[PDB]
Design an enzyme around this catalytic site. Structure first.
Site, short mmCIF file in Angstrom:
data_model
loop_
_atom_site.label_atom_id
_atom_site.label_comp_id
_atom_site.label_asym_id
_atom_site.label_seq_id
_atom_site.Cartn_x
_atom_site.Cartn_y
_atom_site.Cartn_z
N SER A 5 -38.75 19.68 19.34
CA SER A 5 -38.27 21.06 19.48
C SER A 5 -37.85 21.61 18.11
CB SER A 5 -37.19 21.11 20.56
OG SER A 5 -36.85 22.43 20.95
N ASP A 49 -44.21 23.58 29.72
CA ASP A 49 -43.00 23.69 28.90
C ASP A 49 -42.56 25.15 28.85
OD1 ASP A 49 -41.10 23.79 26.75
OD2 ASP A 49 -42.16 22.21 25.61
N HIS A 80 -40.60 20.02 28.93
CA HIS A 80 -40.26 20.05 27.51
C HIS A 80 -39.97 18.69 26.87
CE1 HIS A 80 -38.78 21.87 23.83
NE2 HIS A 80 -37.54 21.41 24.01
C1 LIG Z 1 -35.50 23.03 20.93
O1 LIG Z 1 -34.71 22.43 20.23
N1 LIG Z 1 -35.20 24.12 21.68
C2 LIG Z 1 -33.88 24.75 21.69
C3 LIG Z 1 -33.83 25.46 23.04
C4 LIG Z 1 -35.23 25.51 23.57
C5 LIG Z 1 -36.14 24.81 22.56
C6 LIG Z 1 -34.54 26.81 23.17
C7 LIG Z 1 -34.99 27.69 22.02
C8 LIG Z 1 -35.59 27.32 20.76
C9 LIG Z 1 -35.85 28.49 20.12
N2 LIG Z 1 -35.45 29.49 20.94
C10 LIG Z 1 -35.65 30.90 20.78
C11 LIG Z 1 -35.15 31.79 21.72
C12 LIG Z 1 -35.53 33.12 21.69
C13 LIG Z 1 -36.40 33.53 20.71
F1 LIG Z 1 -36.82 34.82 20.72
C14 LIG Z 1 -36.88 32.69 19.74
C15 LIG Z 1 -36.49 31.36 19.78
N3 LIG Z 1 -34.90 29.01 22.10
#
Ligand SMILES: *C(=O)N1C[C@@H]2[C@H](C1)[C@@H]2c1ccn(-c2ccc(F)cc2)n1
Ligand SMILES: *C(=O)N1C[C@@H]2[C@H](C1)[C@H]2c1ccn(-c2ccc(F)cc2)n1
EC number: 3.1.1.23
Lengths: 280, 283
Positions: B117, B226, B256
């Site tokens: 992620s 995901d 995910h």
């Molecule tokens: C990974 O570490 N993640 C963190 C949690 C899930 C994925 C969520 C996330 C990552 C990036 N964003 C995000 C949200 C809104 C947007 F417009 C861009 C990025 N959420």
């Protein structure tokens, strides 16, 4: 005289076999692309035979040493029917052995349609730049009606030959391609162009039911099978076991590309088939 | 008084490092019995911590790799306000600090990066900053694809402004893993803070700009279902990265957290990483 098979239409298909010394661990059918023939898979087949796989192939109707008017087919399904005939004969002689399919370009569309016709039957599929997408400029209702109209009066009219330099960055392999008397380098005939459009339409419909494990190898600079079709195959196939490898800047014939690309292609197929052959 | 973790353990009792901002980061090491064949840094995702990579790290250590990790600033046992960062680059800078210290102790060893992620976006930016330095990268559902700027200046009047906490069921189809996630005291399950969301948007924009110069070999593992990192982003990474050695594996219907998914998915994930790193460690 030569190893052969007689298809459902009574046509002689030239056959090729690469049998390992000992007992085979699996069977693998090699499906060649449009205009080429099974003799171009000599090196790949020798590598696979070295993994104790029994490799077998035939030249599709209208190709290589098989019968038929060059690069013409009554219906694209003829190719699929003939692969299934050959696979069924081999399986009768080697019961219980897993069977793999390896296909390039049009041979890849044939492999997809072959696996889609027999769900859960094939152990796996290796696809090298498979034909899965039509150029949207050639698939419009206008262009299909124009081709169909042209087909009625001049079915053998040639669409013009491709620049063989789009096949591979390896100049020696382009020169080998251009001097092989078994390759048909004549332009695509209107009637066959329509059959390739039928193949692409049938592939698209088959993807939601395709569950066979597969390895997909694709060059990013392929002008014949656009890389976007490889991403769509990864997305739309329902297979639980699917792997994609992109070769950056590589052209269409990955197994005859620059040595750095070709060595990786052979190695990746070797590892992928080997891991799924031990499983048997 | 000695510096302590947010859970009150003195840092003098734990493996740690002090970053360029003078913040303590908790460190984790999985050293093989014999001489290591390679080094591998594990970069965790947003809200989680390095302790969640115990099983993956043990598998890698079994391949004679020295596995090392730290909890990113504002995560797990490291210092910092929870899930907040002055600039996303802090995470990259800190990874490079840890990699540079390890390399000084193990000269000549190839170094790999493994990221999930946000940890995957960190790994991409880390490799893009040092071309030809990393032997390879393993990415598990990396964060690559995205007017909260009004809310950023409204995060001067409302600093704690968050987006809703995510439904833990979205992380994995494996119910046991969803329950483990929900009861780990080191995981921050609070919703994503607006100031941090802006930093994640900076990460995605920086990842997009880095792809034309990214040449590091990589393995990309992605679930088709995901909801946090859309599978579309994995196809775009395959297309835009300039790496000559790039492989994508799609897990049909998987969520995910692929390394904590249904056993059929998790076993394949571990096996694929094992084979990929092993083939590039023999070299
Ligand atoms: C990974 O570490 N993640 C963190 C949690 C899930 C994925 C969520 C996330 C990552 C990036 N964003 C995000 C949200 C809104 C947007 F417009 C861009 C990025 N959420
Ligand atoms: C595989 O065997 N393939 C890949 C794909 C067809 C068969 C080949 C292709 C794409 C575009 N064209 C083509 C041919 C002739 C022409 F004038 C214009 C395009 N052939």
């Amino acid at each position: 005289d030569l190893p052969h098979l007689v298809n459902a239409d009574g046509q002689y298909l030239f056959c090729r076999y690469w049998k390992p010394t000992g007992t085979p661990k699996a069977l693998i059918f090699v499906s060649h692309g449009a205009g080429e023939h099974s003799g171009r898979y000599e090196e790949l087949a020798r590598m696979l035979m070295g993994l104790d796989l029994l490799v077998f192939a035939h030249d599709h109707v209208g190709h290589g040493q098989s019968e038929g008017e060059r690069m013409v087919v009554s219906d694209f399904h003829v190719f699929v029917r003939d692969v299934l005939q050959h696979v069924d004969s081999m399986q009768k002689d080697y019961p219980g052995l897993p069977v793999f399919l390896l296909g390039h370009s049009m041979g890849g569309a044939i492999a997809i349609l072959t696996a889609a016709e027999r769900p859960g039957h094939f152990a796996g599929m290796v696809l090298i730049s498979p034909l899965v997408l039509a150029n949207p400029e050639s698939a419009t209702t206008f262009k299909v009606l124009a081709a169909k109209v042209l087909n009625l009066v001049l079915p053998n009219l040639s669409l013009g030959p491709i620049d063989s330099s789009v096949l591979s960055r390896n100049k020696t392999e382009v020169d080998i391609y251009n001097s092989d008397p078994l390759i048909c380098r004549a332009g695509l005939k209107v009637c066959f162009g329509i059959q390739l459009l039928n193949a692409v339409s049938r592939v698209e419909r088959a993807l939601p039911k395709l569950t066979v494990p597969f390895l997909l190898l694709q060059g990013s600079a392929d002008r014949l099978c656009d890389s976007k079709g490889a991403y769509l195959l990864m997305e739309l196939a329902k297979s639980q076991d699917k792997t994609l490898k992109i070769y950056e800047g590589a052209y269409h014939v990955l197994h005859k590309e620059l040595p750095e690309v070709t060595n990786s292609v052979f190695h990746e197929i070797n590892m992928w088939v080997s891991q799924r052959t031990a499983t048997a």
